[PDB]
């Protein structure tokens, strides 16, 4: 529902999702063949499912096609410094794709907003929802569209008949947290092909034994996982598949 929804949010107030007490697989997010750009700093894009962390912070907002290069640590501009700042120790993983047939319509879709003016810089990972008129001059104006007072929040120009570098791009960033806590959301070895009657090596959560897997004729009680024998040897392990 974060990826596929009826509508999205803006950049001054974006959607914040926390992934806790869950398990996921990042293999279906790589073989989709539908994303435009894919950058993943701090960790390799194909070896991030084995190493897993504490928490996953995912933020979702919309951005134009010419500003997708601004979501990176170590540059200055207009959007990456007034709406969402990227720190130096940024191990996030950004995913962007084009869905111009849903977030735009004929006549002018101006439902999403952005902030243009700001007094000073802001700390990264901080949301700014201030709707105050940024004063440019030295005199107070008391909320009027007069001189030396301009509104920081301005509208977009999304049109579905545009080119490539100015279309509404759905951009999401997946950041990880590293604290003194055990692994919660994690990627565990998935599920390989089941083979039998060969000299194989398996690791069923309690042991690493090398041998064969013959079909037994005894059914176990539905509360055990392993099985010993007379000679005190674990030679019967229930397959969790």
């Amino acid at each position, epitope marked *: *529902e974060v990826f596929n929804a009826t509508r999205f949010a803006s950049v001054y107030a974006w959607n914040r999702k926390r992934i806790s007490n869950c398990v996921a697989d990042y293999s279906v997010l790589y073989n989709s063949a539908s994303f435009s750009t894919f950058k993943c700093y701090g960790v390799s894009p194909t070896k991030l499912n084995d190493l897993c962390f504490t928490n996953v912070y995912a933020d979702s907002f919309v951005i134009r096609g010419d500003e997708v290069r601004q979501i990176a640590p170590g540059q200055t501009g207009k959007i990456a410094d007034y709406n969402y700042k990227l720190p130096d120790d940024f191990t996030g993983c950004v995913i962007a794709w084009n869905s111009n047939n849903l977030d735009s319509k004929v006549g002018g879709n101006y439902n999403y*907003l952005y902030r243009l003016f700001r007094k000073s810089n802001l700390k990264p990972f*901080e*949301r700014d929802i*201030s*709707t105050e008129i940024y004063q440019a001059g030295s005199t107070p104006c008391n909320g009027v569209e007069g001189f030396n007072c301009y509104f920081p929040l301005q509208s977009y120009g999304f049109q579905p008949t545009n080119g490539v570098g100015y279309q509404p791009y759905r951009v999401v960033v997946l950041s990880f947290e590293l604290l003194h806590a055990p692994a919660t959301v994690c990627g565990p070895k998935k599920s390989t092909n089941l083979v039998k009657n060969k000299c194989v090596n398996f690791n069923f959560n309690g042991l690493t034994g090398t041998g064969v897997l013959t079909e037994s004729n005894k059914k176990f009680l539905p509360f055990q996982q392993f099985g010993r024998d007379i000679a005190d040897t674990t030679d019967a392990v229930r397959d969790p598949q």
Partner: antibody
Framework: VQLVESGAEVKKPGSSVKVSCKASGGTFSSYAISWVRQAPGQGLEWMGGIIPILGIANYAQKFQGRVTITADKSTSTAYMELSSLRSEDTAVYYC?????????????????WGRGTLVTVSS | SVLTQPPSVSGAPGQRVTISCTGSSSNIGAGYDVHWYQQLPGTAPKLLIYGNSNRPSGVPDRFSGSKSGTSASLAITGLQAEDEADYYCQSYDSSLSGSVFGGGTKLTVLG
């Protein structure tokens, strides 16, 4: 400042309601204005919020396309239009004001409220 | 909906009475600030405390708001003759794309 709303109003089950939101003084053409409802029996819901400067609508996903809120800059008033009324529309609406700030939370708060419009509908 | 609240709470006029608001990990536990309101039966609700760190003008300092992880708490000291209203917990939810209120607790003496 203070926001003045209309009094009681009754209509038909399937007709349109036309209420307004008056503002006394200023500080109305600079901040966002939303509409918060309240019904006896359940909690408080939130229909949507309208910015008066750019005139951009921002509703919720729980409410479908049946209510439209407009704004005016000449007299600094807001109107509410809602048609195809149902049997659970017997509630009261409030004309609220939003004042954003900065911080890690950055949540929308309602510092200034209105008076109230009792809109009940039945046979 | 996503925010639940106790239906009623008992207290004594002179002790500390605390209340809690429990939701999900995407509206209150994600990092958004909470806002508490008072619904008096007969007038419009006003603002009591925003962000659980600042104090608006016109409110007493007896109200204390805090956020313990995924849940928010409101503690008061002393029951006066104006606490016959309902308390709601309001937080910005991303799954609903807007602000959603709580259930509401009644705290009025029988007398």
């Amino acid at each position: 400042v203070q926001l003045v709303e209309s009094g009681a109003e009754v209509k038909k089950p399937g007709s349109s309601v036309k209420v307004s939101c008056k503002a006394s003084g200023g500080t109305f053409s600079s901040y966002a204005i939303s509409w918060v409802r309240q019904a006896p029996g359940q909690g408080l819901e939130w229909m949507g919020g309208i910015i008066p400067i750019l005139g951009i609508a921002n509703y919720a996903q729980k409410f479908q396309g049946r209510v439209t809120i407009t704004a005016d800059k000449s007299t600094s008033t807001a109107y509410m239009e809602l048609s195809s009324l149902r049997s659970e529309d017997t509630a009261v609406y409030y004309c609220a004001r939003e004042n954003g700030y900065s911080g890690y939370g950055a949540a929308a708060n309602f510092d200034l409220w209105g008076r109230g419009t009792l809109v009940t509908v039945s046979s | 909906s996503v925010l639940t609240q106790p239906p009623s709470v008992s207290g004594a006029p002179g002790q500390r009475v605390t209340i809690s608001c429990t939701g999900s990990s995407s509206n209150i536990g994600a990092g958004y600030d909470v806002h508490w309101y008072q619904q008096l039966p007969g007038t419009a609700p006003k603002l009591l405390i925003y962000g659980n760190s600042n104090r608006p003008s016109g409110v007493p300092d007896r109200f204390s708001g805090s956020k313990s992880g995924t849940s928010a708490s409101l503690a008061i000291t002393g029951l006066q003759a104006e606490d016959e209203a309902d308390y709601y917990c309001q937080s910005y939810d991303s799954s609903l794309s807007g602000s959603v209120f709580g259930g509401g607790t009644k705290l009025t003496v029988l007398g």
